[PDB]
Amino acid sequence: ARSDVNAITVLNGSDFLTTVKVRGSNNLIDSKSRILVKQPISASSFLGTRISGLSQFWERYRWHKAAVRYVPAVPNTLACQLIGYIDTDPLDDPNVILDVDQLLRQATSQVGARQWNFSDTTTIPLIVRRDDQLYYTGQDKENVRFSQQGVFYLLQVTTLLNISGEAITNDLISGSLYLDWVCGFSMPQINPS
């Protein structure tokens, strides 16, 4: 019962991340405004979820099979495109980019990218590196390439408009993001909070 053995505990689950909010007309004036979501895919980044509550009780993690999911809360009459991709290198910050087309293109260039209208649903797969490197579970520290295994950027390609042609300006909510994940934790512990 007092075993000093370490082993990966690969356990599965699902979680609710947050509700997206298409930026609309007013709040959309430049490129960086078109970045709705910048959410690290570190296990311990989603506070109340089960994944993070578990992560708090280990040192390390590694997404063996993760996939962000979009579930719309709108009709099919509204119109706006969305692009989503998970950059496996956190320190790649597109916010510095001004040219919007350059932004969408460096997004599409990432392999796991996805484009979808905010009236249907699609899945954003996380692509896993090939070296077996484990990542630390605690809050982000001096460097990020240790903790974060990826970063989910959600983009607004077009402008938001309604049944009629008038474009909305009220910055409404379109859907919700879920995470159907499979992770492997290595070292039992407790992280400070």
Partner: peptide
């Protein structure tokens, strides 16, 4: 007998909303 005098054809097509990609 005179065949195919005034032959008309019909082929219905749907027209959905929000063709998605």
């Amino acid at each position: 007998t005179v065949p195919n005098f005034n032959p008309i054809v019909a082929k219905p097509t749907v027209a959905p909303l929000q063709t998605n990609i």
